[PDB]
Protein backbone atom coordinates (compact mmCIF):
# COMPACT_ATOMS: atom_id res chain seq x y z
CA UNK A 1 0.00 0.00 0.00
CA UNK A 2 2.42 2.58 -1.36
CA UNK A 3 4.47 0.84 -2.79
CA UNK A 4 2.34 0.94 -5.96
CA UNK A 5 1.73 3.72 -8.50
CA UNK A 6 -1.82 4.59 -7.41
CA UNK A 7 -3.57 5.96 -4.36
CA UNK A 8 -7.29 5.57 -3.64
CA UNK A 9 -9.09 8.87 -3.07
CA UNK A 10 -12.72 9.15 -2.01
CA UNK A 11 -14.43 11.87 -4.05
CA UNK A 12 -17.72 13.72 -4.12
CA UNK A 13 -18.66 16.13 -6.94
CA UNK A 14 -21.34 18.80 -6.52
CA UNK A 15 -23.32 21.82 -7.81
CA UNK A 16 -26.32 23.26 -5.85
CA UNK A 17 -28.57 26.19 -6.89
CA UNK A 18 -25.07 7.93 -5.30
CA UNK A 19 -22.08 9.99 -6.46
CA UNK A 20 -19.28 9.45 -3.93
CA UNK A 21 -16.50 6.89 -4.27
CA UNK A 22 -12.80 6.02 -4.53
CA UNK A 23 -10.91 6.93 -7.65
CA UNK A 24 -7.36 5.71 -8.16
CA UNK A 25 -4.97 8.53 -8.96
CA UNK A 26 -1.26 8.72 -9.64
CA UNK A 27 0.51 9.04 -6.30
CA UNK A 28 3.37 10.55 -8.31
CA UNK A 29 1.47 13.44 -9.89
CA UNK A 30 1.06 16.98 -8.50
CA UNK A 31 -1.21 17.70 -5.55
CA UNK A 32 -2.38 20.80 -7.45
CA UNK A 33 -3.81 18.75 -10.36
CA UNK A 34 -5.64 16.38 -8.07
CA UNK A 35 -9.01 18.05 -8.65
CA UNK A 36 -8.41 17.90 -12.37
CA UNK A 37 -7.43 14.25 -12.53
CA UNK A 38 -10.22 13.20 -10.20
CA UNK A 39 -12.72 14.93 -12.45
CA UNK A 40 -11.30 13.54 -15.69
CA UNK A 41 -11.54 10.03 -14.21
CA UNK A 42 -15.20 10.87 -13.73
CA UNK A 43 -15.80 12.13 -17.26
CA UNK A 44 -15.44 15.88 -17.10
CA UNK A 45 -14.34 18.18 -19.85
CA UNK A 46 -10.79 19.46 -19.39
CA UNK A 47 -12.47 22.86 -19.03
CA UNK A 48 -14.91 21.58 -16.38
CA UNK A 49 -11.86 21.20 -14.19
CA UNK A 50 -11.72 24.99 -14.27
CA UNK A 51 -15.08 26.16 -12.94
CA UNK A 52 -14.21 23.68 -10.16
CA UNK A 53 -13.55 24.51 -6.49
CA UNK A 54 -11.92 22.07 -4.03
CA UNK A 55 -12.49 21.42 -0.33
CA UNK A 56 -10.68 18.64 1.55
CA UNK A 57 -12.28 17.18 4.68
CA UNK A 58 -10.64 15.01 7.35
CA UNK A 59 -12.88 12.45 9.08
CA UNK A 60 -15.77 14.57 10.42
CA UNK A 61 -13.97 17.89 10.52
CA UNK A 62 -15.01 20.91 8.62
CA UNK A 63 -13.33 20.67 5.21
CA UNK A 64 -10.70 23.22 4.23
CA UNK A 65 -9.38 24.56 0.90
CA UNK A 66 -6.54 22.49 -0.59
CA UNK A 67 -4.63 25.72 0.01
CA UNK A 68 -4.29 24.75 3.66
CA UNK A 69 -2.67 21.38 3.00
CA UNK A 70 0.51 22.84 1.52
CA UNK A 71 1.90 25.92 -0.21
CA UNK A 72 4.65 24.17 -2.20
CA UNK A 73 3.50 23.81 -5.84
CA UNK A 74 5.97 20.93 -6.18
CA UNK A 75 4.29 18.50 -3.75
CA UNK A 76 2.68 15.30 -5.05
CA UNK A 77 -0.46 13.35 -4.19
CA UNK A 78 1.70 10.84 -2.29
CA UNK A 79 3.63 13.55 -0.41
CA UNK A 80 0.37 14.69 1.10
CA UNK A 81 -2.17 11.87 1.22
CA UNK A 82 0.01 8.79 1.39
CA UNK A 83 -0.74 8.69 5.12
CA UNK A 84 -4.30 10.04 5.21
CA UNK A 85 -6.03 8.66 2.10
CA UNK A 86 -8.21 6.40 4.28
CA UNK A 87 -9.64 9.30 6.29
CA UNK A 88 -9.86 12.14 3.80
CA UNK A 89 -12.75 12.94 1.47
CA UNK A 90 -12.18 15.26 -1.47
CA UNK A 91 -15.07 17.63 -2.08
CA UNK A 92 -15.22 19.02 -5.59
CA UNK A 93 -17.53 21.93 -6.32
CA UNK A 94 -18.65 22.52 -9.93
CA UNK A 95 -19.48 26.19 -10.46
CA UNK A 96 -28.09 25.89 -14.16
CA UNK A 97 -31.57 27.13 -13.04
CA UNK A 98 -31.82 30.64 -11.60
CA UNK A 99 -32.51 31.59 -8.01
CA UNK A 100 -35.68 33.47 -9.04
CA UNK A 101 -36.78 30.29 -10.76
CA UNK A 102 -36.26 28.17 -7.61
CA UNK A 103 -39.70 27.53 -6.01
CA UNK A 104 -39.90 28.99 -2.45
CA UNK A 105 -39.95 25.60 -0.61
CA UNK A 106 -36.83 24.34 -2.42
CA UNK A 107 -35.13 27.20 -0.68
CA UNK A 108 -32.53 26.31 1.89
CA UNK A 109 -30.32 28.23 4.30
CA UNK A 110 -27.37 27.69 1.98
CA UNK A 111 -29.24 29.22 -0.97
CA UNK A 112 -30.58 32.03 1.24
CA UNK A 113 -26.97 32.71 2.27
CA UNK A 114 -25.92 32.72 -1.40
CA UNK A 115 -28.79 35.04 -2.37
CA UNK A 116 -27.88 37.42 0.47
CA UNK A 117 -24.24 37.36 -0.50
CA UNK A 118 -24.93 38.62 -4.04
CA UNK A 119 -27.36 41.29 -2.89
CA UNK A 120 -25.03 42.82 -0.29
CA UNK A 121 -22.51 43.57 -3.05
CA UNK A 122 -24.85 46.33 -4.24
CA UNK A 123 -26.99 46.97 -1.12
CA UNK A 124 -26.89 47.64 2.61
CA UNK A 125 -27.90 45.36 5.50
CA UNK A 126 -30.45 47.74 7.07
CA UNK A 127 -32.11 48.44 3.73
CA UNK A 128 -32.18 44.76 2.81
CA UNK A 129 -33.49 43.81 6.24
CA UNK A 130 -36.31 46.22 5.43
CA UNK A 131 -38.55 44.37 2.94
CA UNK A 132 -36.96 40.96 2.82
CA UNK A 133 -38.62 38.85 5.55
CA UNK A 134 -35.31 38.71 7.45
CA UNK A 135 -34.16 40.86 10.39
CA UNK A 136 -30.80 42.65 10.59
CA UNK A 137 -29.31 40.47 13.31
CA UNK A 138 -30.59 37.48 11.32
CA UNK A 139 -28.85 38.69 8.16
CA UNK A 140 -25.53 39.24 9.90
CA UNK A 141 -25.48 35.70 11.34
CA UNK A 142 -26.05 34.11 7.93
CA UNK A 143 -23.36 36.05 6.11
CA UNK A 144 -20.91 35.92 9.01
CA UNK A 145 -21.34 32.13 8.58
CA UNK A 146 -21.43 31.41 12.32
CA UNK A 147 -22.29 29.36 14.12
CA UNK A 148 -25.16 28.95 13.80
CA UNK A 149 -27.10 30.94 12.49
CA UNK A 150 -30.23 29.20 11.18
CA UNK A 151 -33.24 30.12 9.07
CA UNK A 152 -36.44 28.20 9.71
CA UNK A 153 -38.32 26.52 6.86
CA UNK A 154 -40.84 29.34 7.27
CA UNK A 155 -38.33 32.15 6.74
CA UNK A 156 -36.50 30.24 3.94
CA UNK A 157 -39.74 29.79 2.05
CA UNK A 158 -40.72 33.45 2.55
CA UNK A 159 -37.31 34.86 1.66
CA UNK A 160 -37.41 32.86 -1.57
CA UNK A 161 -40.87 34.01 -2.60
CA UNK A 162 -39.83 37.58 -1.85
CA UNK A 163 -36.62 37.10 -3.82
CA UNK A 164 -38.45 35.87 -6.89
CA UNK A 165 -40.63 38.94 -6.83
CA UNK A 166 -37.95 41.44 -5.97
CA UNK A 167 -35.93 40.18 -8.93
CA UNK A 168 -38.64 40.91 -11.48
CA UNK A 169 -39.34 44.57 -10.56
CA UNK B 1 -12.26 4.32 -46.02
CA UNK B 2 -11.39 7.52 -44.10
CA UNK B 3 -8.01 9.11 -44.99
CA UNK B 4 -9.60 12.54 -44.75
CA UNK B 5 -8.53 15.26 -42.35
CA UNK B 6 -11.76 14.34 -40.52
CA UNK B 7 -13.66 11.50 -38.86
CA UNK B 8 -17.38 11.39 -38.10
CA UNK B 9 -18.59 10.67 -34.54
CA UNK B 10 -22.15 9.93 -33.54
CA UNK B 11 -23.23 12.10 -30.61
CA UNK B 12 -26.07 11.94 -28.14
CA UNK B 13 -26.56 14.98 -25.92
CA UNK B 14 -28.63 14.54 -22.73
CA UNK B 15 -29.63 17.00 -19.97
CA UNK B 16 -34.74 16.11 -24.38
CA UNK B 17 -32.00 14.33 -26.36
CA UNK B 18 -30.13 15.71 -29.41
CA UNK B 19 -28.33 13.20 -31.63
CA UNK B 20 -26.23 13.77 -34.74
CA UNK B 21 -22.96 12.91 -36.45
CA UNK B 22 -20.24 15.52 -36.29
CA UNK B 23 -17.04 15.62 -38.26
CA UNK B 24 -14.06 15.85 -35.97
CA UNK B 25 -10.54 16.87 -36.97
CA UNK B 26 -8.13 13.94 -36.84
CA UNK B 27 -5.21 16.14 -35.76
CA UNK B 28 -7.09 17.52 -32.76
CA UNK B 29 -6.50 16.13 -29.23
CA UNK B 30 -8.53 13.09 -28.10
CA UNK B 31 -9.34 14.56 -24.66
CA UNK B 32 -10.77 17.65 -26.43
CA UNK B 33 -13.43 15.41 -27.97
CA UNK B 34 -16.32 16.70 -25.85
CA UNK B 35 -15.45 20.39 -26.34
CA UNK B 36 -15.32 20.00 -30.11
CA UNK B 37 -18.35 17.78 -30.30
CA UNK B 38 -20.30 20.46 -28.44
CA UNK B 39 -19.03 23.52 -30.33
CA UNK B 40 -19.29 21.78 -33.64
CA UNK B 41 -22.78 20.62 -32.58
CA UNK B 42 -24.10 24.14 -31.92
CA UNK B 43 -23.44 24.90 -28.24
CA UNK B 44 -21.32 27.42 -26.32
CA UNK B 45 -17.85 27.25 -24.72
CA UNK B 46 -19.49 27.67 -21.34
CA UNK B 47 -21.59 24.60 -22.18
CA UNK B 48 -18.44 22.46 -22.35
CA UNK B 49 -17.30 23.40 -18.84
CA UNK B 50 -20.69 22.22 -17.53
CA UNK B 51 -20.62 18.78 -19.23
CA UNK B 52 -19.87 15.18 -18.27
CA UNK B 53 -18.76 13.00 -21.21
CA UNK B 54 -18.64 9.25 -21.73
CA UNK B 55 -17.73 7.16 -24.83
CA UNK B 56 -19.55 3.93 -25.74
CA UNK B 57 -18.22 1.08 -27.87
CA UNK B 58 -21.21 -0.81 -29.21
CA UNK B 59 -23.47 -1.86 -26.35
CA UNK B 60 -20.64 -1.79 -23.76
CA UNK B 61 -20.55 0.19 -20.51
CA UNK B 62 -19.82 3.83 -21.51
CA UNK B 63 -16.52 5.09 -20.09
CA UNK B 64 -14.65 8.31 -19.53
CA UNK B 65 -12.23 9.39 -22.29
CA UNK B 66 -9.40 8.60 -19.82
CA UNK B 67 -10.13 4.90 -19.59
CA UNK B 68 -9.45 4.94 -23.34
CA UNK B 69 -5.85 6.11 -23.16
CA UNK B 70 -3.33 7.56 -20.71
CA UNK B 71 -1.45 9.61 -23.36
CA UNK B 72 -2.52 13.28 -23.26
CA UNK B 73 -0.89 13.94 -26.64
CA UNK B 74 -3.34 11.38 -28.17
CA UNK B 75 -4.92 12.54 -31.46
CA UNK B 76 -8.45 11.71 -32.49
CA UNK B 77 -7.02 9.66 -35.39
CA UNK B 78 -4.93 7.65 -32.90
CA UNK B 79 -7.95 6.42 -30.94
CA UNK B 80 -10.88 6.61 -33.33
CA UNK B 81 -9.46 5.81 -36.80
CA UNK B 82 -10.38 2.13 -36.40
CA UNK B 83 -13.62 2.34 -34.45
CA UNK B 84 -15.36 5.61 -35.17
CA UNK B 85 -18.33 3.74 -36.69
CA UNK B 86 -19.06 1.57 -33.66
CA UNK B 87 -18.71 4.31 -31.01
CA UNK B 88 -21.39 6.62 -29.57
CA UNK B 89 -20.21 9.65 -27.60
CA UNK B 90 -22.94 10.46 -25.03
CA UNK B 91 -22.73 13.90 -23.41
CA UNK B 92 -24.52 15.40 -20.40
CA UNK B 93 -25.36 19.04 -19.75
CA UNK B 94 -25.99 20.21 -16.15
CA UNK C 1 -15.17 7.46 3.03
CA UNK C 2 -17.99 4.84 2.99
CA UNK C 3 -19.18 4.14 -0.56
CA UNK C 4 -19.86 0.76 -2.17
CA UNK C 5 -16.17 -0.10 -2.76
CA UNK C 6 -12.98 -0.70 -0.75
CA UNK C 7 -9.43 -0.19 -2.08
CA UNK C 8 -7.40 -3.38 -1.63
CA UNK C 9 -3.69 -3.56 -2.38
CA UNK C 10 -3.04 -6.81 -4.29
CA UNK C 11 0.20 -8.50 -5.24
CA UNK C 12 -0.14 -11.40 -7.65
CA UNK C 13 2.79 -13.85 -7.81
CA UNK C 14 3.32 -16.31 -10.74
CA UNK C 15 4.41 -9.48 -11.06
CA UNK C 16 1.25 -7.27 -10.83
CA UNK C 17 1.23 -5.35 -7.47
CA UNK C 18 -1.45 -2.65 -7.13
CA UNK C 19 -4.68 -1.34 -5.62
CA UNK C 20 -7.96 -2.85 -6.70
CA UNK C 21 -11.40 -1.57 -5.71
CA UNK C 22 -13.90 -4.25 -4.72
CA UNK C 23 -17.57 -4.40 -3.67
CA UNK C 24 -17.66 -3.91 0.14
CA UNK C 25 -20.82 -6.04 0.29
CA UNK C 26 -19.23 -9.00 -1.52
CA UNK C 27 -18.32 -12.08 0.52
CA UNK C 28 -14.91 -12.13 2.15
CA UNK C 29 -14.46 -15.64 0.76
CA UNK C 30 -14.74 -14.27 -2.79
CA UNK C 31 -12.04 -11.69 -2.28
CA UNK C 32 -9.46 -13.58 -4.36
CA UNK C 33 -11.85 -14.52 -7.13
CA UNK C 34 -13.20 -11.01 -7.42
CA UNK C 35 -9.81 -9.30 -7.15
CA UNK C 36 -8.50 -11.72 -9.79
CA UNK C 37 -11.39 -10.94 -12.16
CA UNK C 38 -10.66 -7.19 -11.92
CA UNK C 39 -7.14 -7.93 -13.14
CA UNK C 40 -7.92 -10.20 -16.09
CA UNK C 41 -7.72 -13.77 -14.78
CA UNK C 42 -10.52 -16.11 -15.81
CA UNK C 43 -13.27 -17.52 -13.62
CA UNK C 44 -11.07 -20.61 -13.72
CA UNK C 45 -7.85 -19.18 -12.32
CA UNK C 46 -9.91 -18.17 -9.26
CA UNK C 47 -9.39 -20.41 -7.84
CA UNK C 48 -6.56 -22.80 -8.27
CA UNK C 49 -5.43 -19.70 -6.41
CA UNK C 50 -3.71 -19.44 -2.99
CA UNK C 51 -4.37 -16.33 -0.85
CA UNK C 52 -2.35 -14.99 2.07
CA UNK C 53 -2.76 -11.61 3.72
CA UNK C 54 -0.17 -9.41 5.37
CA UNK C 55 -0.99 -6.69 7.88
CA UNK C 56 1.61 -3.94 8.02
CA UNK C 57 5.00 -5.54 8.56
CA UNK C 58 3.90 -8.90 9.97
CA UNK C 59 4.23 -12.34 8.55
CA UNK C 60 1.32 -12.98 6.17
CA UNK C 61 -1.44 -15.38 7.20
CA UNK C 62 -3.74 -17.54 5.16
CA UNK C 63 -7.11 -15.84 4.64
CA UNK C 64 -8.73 -18.61 6.72
CA UNK C 65 -7.10 -17.26 9.89
CA UNK C 66 -9.00 -14.04 9.23
CA UNK C 67 -12.40 -15.69 9.75
CA UNK C 68 -14.62 -18.79 9.40
CA UNK C 69 -17.90 -16.88 9.07
CA UNK C 70 -19.02 -17.67 5.45
CA UNK C 71 -21.45 -14.73 5.61
CA UNK C 72 -18.66 -12.20 6.27
CA UNK C 73 -18.71 -9.19 3.96
CA UNK C 74 -15.44 -7.74 2.72
CA UNK C 75 -16.52 -4.61 4.54
CA UNK C 76 -16.76 -6.57 7.77
CA UNK C 77 -13.15 -7.71 7.73
CA UNK C 78 -11.63 -4.80 5.86
CA UNK C 79 -13.57 -1.61 6.34
CA UNK C 80 -11.20 -0.85 9.26
CA UNK C 81 -7.86 -2.08 7.97
CA UNK C 82 -7.88 -2.01 4.17
CA UNK C 83 -5.17 0.65 4.38
CA UNK C 84 -2.58 -1.38 6.29
CA UNK C 85 -2.98 -4.73 4.59
CA UNK C 86 -1.64 -6.42 1.46
CA UNK C 87 -3.39 -9.29 -0.29
CA UNK C 88 -0.99 -11.77 -1.87
CA UNK C 89 -2.49 -14.11 -4.44
CA UNK C 90 -0.33 -16.94 -5.71
CA UNK C 91 -1.29 -19.04 -8.70
CA UNK C 92 -0.10 -22.63 -8.89
CA UNK D 1 -25.12 -7.30 -41.95
CA UNK D 2 -25.00 -10.86 -40.36
CA UNK D 3 -28.02 -11.40 -38.04
CA UNK D 4 -28.26 -15.07 -36.97
CA UNK D 5 -26.84 -18.54 -36.96
CA UNK D 6 -25.63 -19.81 -33.60
CA UNK D 7 -21.97 -18.79 -33.79
CA UNK D 8 -19.96 -15.57 -33.64
CA UNK D 9 -16.36 -14.89 -34.64
CA UNK D 10 -13.89 -13.65 -32.06
CA UNK D 11 -10.40 -12.46 -32.96
CA UNK D 12 -7.99 -13.64 -30.27
CA UNK D 13 -4.30 -13.05 -29.77
CA UNK D 14 -2.44 -15.38 -27.44
CA UNK D 15 0.91 -14.84 -25.76
CA UNK D 16 2.63 -17.54 -23.71
CA UNK D 17 6.57 -14.64 -26.19
CA UNK D 18 4.78 -16.53 -28.98
CA UNK D 19 2.22 -14.01 -30.27
CA UNK D 20 -0.44 -16.00 -32.14
CA UNK D 21 -3.37 -14.31 -33.93
CA UNK D 22 -6.56 -16.00 -35.09
CA UNK D 23 -10.29 -15.68 -35.51
CA UNK D 24 -12.30 -18.37 -33.84
CA UNK D 25 -15.98 -19.17 -33.73
CA UNK D 26 -17.76 -19.27 -30.41
CA UNK D 27 -21.30 -20.07 -29.33
CA UNK D 28 -23.26 -16.82 -29.56
CA UNK D 29 -25.62 -17.73 -26.64
CA UNK D 30 -22.86 -18.82 -24.25
CA UNK D 31 -22.01 -16.49 -21.32
CA UNK D 32 -19.74 -13.54 -21.97
CA UNK D 33 -17.83 -14.26 -18.73
CA UNK D 34 -16.63 -17.69 -19.91
CA UNK D 35 -15.31 -16.13 -23.06
CA UNK D 36 -11.65 -16.65 -22.29
CA UNK D 37 -12.09 -20.37 -21.71
CA UNK D 38 -14.44 -20.78 -24.63
CA UNK D 39 -12.01 -18.98 -26.93
CA UNK D 40 -9.12 -21.14 -25.70
CA UNK D 41 -11.03 -24.39 -26.13
CA UNK D 42 -12.38 -23.37 -29.52
CA UNK D 43 -8.77 -22.52 -30.51
CA UNK D 44 -7.45 -26.03 -29.80
CA UNK D 45 -6.17 -25.56 -26.22
CA UNK D 46 -6.61 -27.92 -23.26
CA UNK D 47 -8.65 -26.88 -20.20
CA UNK D 48 -5.46 -26.89 -18.18
CA UNK D 49 -3.99 -23.84 -19.95
CA UNK D 50 -7.19 -21.88 -19.26
CA UNK D 51 -6.51 -21.87 -15.49
CA UNK D 52 -3.51 -19.54 -15.52
CA UNK D 53 -5.07 -17.45 -18.30
CA UNK D 54 -5.20 -13.66 -18.05
CA UNK D 55 -7.57 -12.25 -20.70
CA UNK D 56 -7.88 -8.61 -21.72
CA UNK D 57 -10.33 -7.35 -24.36
CA UNK D 58 -9.20 -4.50 -26.63
CA UNK D 59 -11.21 -2.30 -28.96
CA UNK D 60 -9.14 -0.86 -31.78
CA UNK D 61 -5.98 0.72 -30.42
CA UNK D 62 -7.50 1.52 -26.95
CA UNK D 63 -6.28 0.44 -23.52
CA UNK D 64 -7.06 -3.30 -23.05
CA UNK D 65 -9.58 -4.01 -20.27
CA UNK D 66 -10.82 -6.96 -18.19
CA UNK D 67 -14.11 -8.55 -19.28
CA UNK D 68 -15.64 -7.15 -16.07
CA UNK D 69 -15.30 -3.55 -17.38
CA UNK D 70 -17.21 -4.29 -20.57
CA UNK D 71 -20.18 -5.42 -18.59
CA UNK D 72 -21.72 -6.12 -15.22
CA UNK D 73 -24.74 -8.21 -16.22
CA UNK D 74 -23.64 -11.68 -15.08
CA UNK D 75 -25.97 -13.20 -17.67
CA UNK D 76 -24.80 -11.22 -20.73
CA UNK D 77 -24.16 -13.54 -23.67
CA UNK D 78 -21.24 -13.41 -26.07
CA UNK D 79 -23.92 -12.12 -28.50
CA UNK D 80 -25.08 -9.20 -26.36
CA UNK D 81 -21.62 -7.75 -25.97
CA UNK D 82 -19.74 -8.55 -29.17
CA UNK D 83 -22.50 -9.06 -31.72
CA UNK D 84 -22.05 -5.65 -33.34
CA UNK D 85 -18.36 -5.20 -32.57
CA UNK D 86 -16.54 -8.45 -33.15
CA UNK D 87 -14.58 -6.97 -36.08
CA UNK D 88 -12.92 -4.19 -34.07
CA UNK D 89 -12.08 -6.07 -30.83
CA UNK D 90 -9.21 -8.38 -29.92
CA UNK D 91 -9.11 -10.85 -27.05
CA UNK D 92 -5.53 -10.65 -25.75
CA UNK D 93 -4.88 -13.85 -23.84
CA UNK D 94 -1.81 -14.33 -21.67
CA UNK D 95 -0.94 -17.81 -20.42
CA UNK D 96 1.66 -19.12 -18.07
CA UNK D 97 2.51 -22.14 -20.22
CA UNK D 98 3.84 -23.36 -22.79
CA UNK D 99 1.10 -25.97 -23.30
CA UNK D 100 2.25 -29.56 -23.71
CA UNK D 101 3.23 -29.94 -27.39
CA UNK D 102 -0.04 -31.81 -27.93
CA UNK D 103 -2.12 -28.98 -26.51
CA UNK D 104 -0.47 -26.49 -28.84
CA UNK D 105 -3.05 -25.60 -31.52
CA UNK D 106 -1.71 -27.37 -34.68
CA UNK D 107 -1.82 -24.13 -36.68
CA UNK D 108 0.85 -22.80 -34.37
CA UNK D 109 3.42 -25.55 -34.91
CA UNK D 110 6.72 -24.43 -36.42
CA UNK D 111 9.75 -26.45 -37.57
CA UNK D 112 11.17 -26.21 -34.06
CA UNK D 113 8.08 -27.58 -32.35
CA UNK D 114 8.13 -30.43 -34.86
CA UNK D 115 11.82 -30.98 -33.95
CA UNK D 116 11.01 -31.20 -30.21
CA UNK D 117 8.29 -33.72 -31.05
CA UNK D 118 10.63 -35.90 -33.07
CA UNK D 119 13.17 -35.86 -30.20
CA UNK D 120 10.53 -36.78 -27.60
CA UNK D 121 9.48 -39.64 -29.92
CA UNK D 122 12.93 -40.94 -30.78
CA UNK D 123 13.42 -41.33 -26.97
CA UNK D 124 11.54 -44.62 -27.34
CA UNK D 125 11.04 -45.08 -31.08
CA UNK D 126 12.84 -45.92 -34.29
CA UNK D 127 13.56 -43.54 -37.13
CA UNK D 128 11.76 -46.07 -39.34
CA UNK D 129 8.73 -46.76 -37.17
CA UNK D 130 8.34 -43.01 -36.70
CA UNK D 131 8.79 -42.44 -40.44
CA UNK D 132 6.19 -45.20 -40.87
CA UNK D 133 3.66 -43.57 -38.53
CA UNK D 134 4.09 -39.81 -38.83
CA UNK D 135 3.53 -37.77 -42.05
CA UNK D 136 7.24 -37.15 -42.69
CA UNK D 137 9.71 -39.24 -44.69
CA UNK D 138 12.78 -40.85 -43.14
CA UNK D 139 14.92 -38.54 -45.29
CA UNK D 140 13.32 -35.45 -43.74
CA UNK D 141 13.40 -36.88 -40.21
CA UNK D 142 17.14 -37.21 -40.82
CA UNK D 143 17.21 -33.59 -42.05
CA UNK D 144 15.32 -32.10 -39.09
CA UNK D 145 17.11 -34.17 -36.46
CA UNK D 146 20.74 -33.97 -37.57
CA UNK D 147 20.64 -30.23 -38.33
CA UNK D 148 19.55 -27.47 -35.93
CA UNK D 149 19.51 -24.95 -38.82
CA UNK D 150 17.17 -27.10 -40.90
CA UNK D 151 13.89 -25.22 -41.20
CA UNK D 152 12.66 -26.30 -44.63
CA UNK D 153 9.45 -27.84 -43.32
CA UNK D 154 6.40 -26.48 -45.11
CA UNK D 155 3.53 -24.94 -43.13
CA UNK D 156 1.13 -27.56 -44.43
CA UNK D 157 3.41 -30.34 -43.07
CA UNK D 158 3.87 -28.71 -39.63
CA UNK D 159 0.07 -28.60 -39.19
CA UNK D 160 -0.36 -32.16 -40.53
CA UNK D 161 2.32 -33.60 -38.25
CA UNK D 162 0.90 -31.58 -35.36
CA UNK D 163 -2.57 -33.07 -35.86
CA UNK D 164 -1.03 -36.52 -36.19
CA UNK D 165 0.95 -36.03 -32.96
CA UNK D 166 -2.11 -34.82 -31.08
CA UNK D 167 -3.95 -38.00 -32.03
CA UNK D 168 -1.70 -40.57 -30.38
CA UNK D 169 -0.31 -39.43 -28.13
**How far do the termini of chain A sit from each other?**
60 Å
CATH uppermost class of the largest domain in chain A: Alpha Beta
Total helical segments of chain A: 6
Number of domains of chain A: 2
If you consult CATH, what is the topology of the largest domain in chain A? Ubiquitin-like (UB roll)
GO cellular component, one term (chain D): PML body
Domain CMP (chain D): 5-97
Subcellular location (chain D): Nucleus; Nucleus, PML body
Domain CUTL (chain D): 100-169
Architecture overview:
Chain B: Belongs to the CUT homeobox family. Chain B: The modification N6-acetyllysine is found at residue 59. Chain B: It is found in: Nucleus; Nucleus, PML body. Chain B: A motif (Protein interaction) lies at residues 62-66. Chain B: Residues 4-94 form the CMP domain. The structure is a homotetramer. The first copy, chain A, is an alpha+beta fold and 169 residues long. Chain A has two domains: 1-95, SATB, ubiquitin-like oligomerisation domain (Ubiquitin-like (UB roll), Roll); 96-169, Orthogonal Bundle (434 Repressor (Amino-terminal Domain)). The first copy, chain A, has six helices and five strands. The first copy, chain A, has helices at residues 34-40, 77-81, 109-121, 125-131, 136-144, 153-167, and strands spanning 6-14, 20-26, 52-58, 64-65, 88-94. In chain A, strands 2-1-5-3-4 form a five-stranded mixed β-sheet. In chain A, strand 3 and strand 4 form a beta hairpin. The N and C termini of chain A lie far apart (60 Å). In chain A, 25% of the residues are buried. Chains in contact: A-B, A-C, B-D, C-D. The interface between A and C is medium-sized, with 18 and 16 residues.
Amino acid sequence: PGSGTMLPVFCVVEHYEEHAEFVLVRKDMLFNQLIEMALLSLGYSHSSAAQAKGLIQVGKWNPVPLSYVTDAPDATVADMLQDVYHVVTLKIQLHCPKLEDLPPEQWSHTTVRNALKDLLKDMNQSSLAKECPLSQSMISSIVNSTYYANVSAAKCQEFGRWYKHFKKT
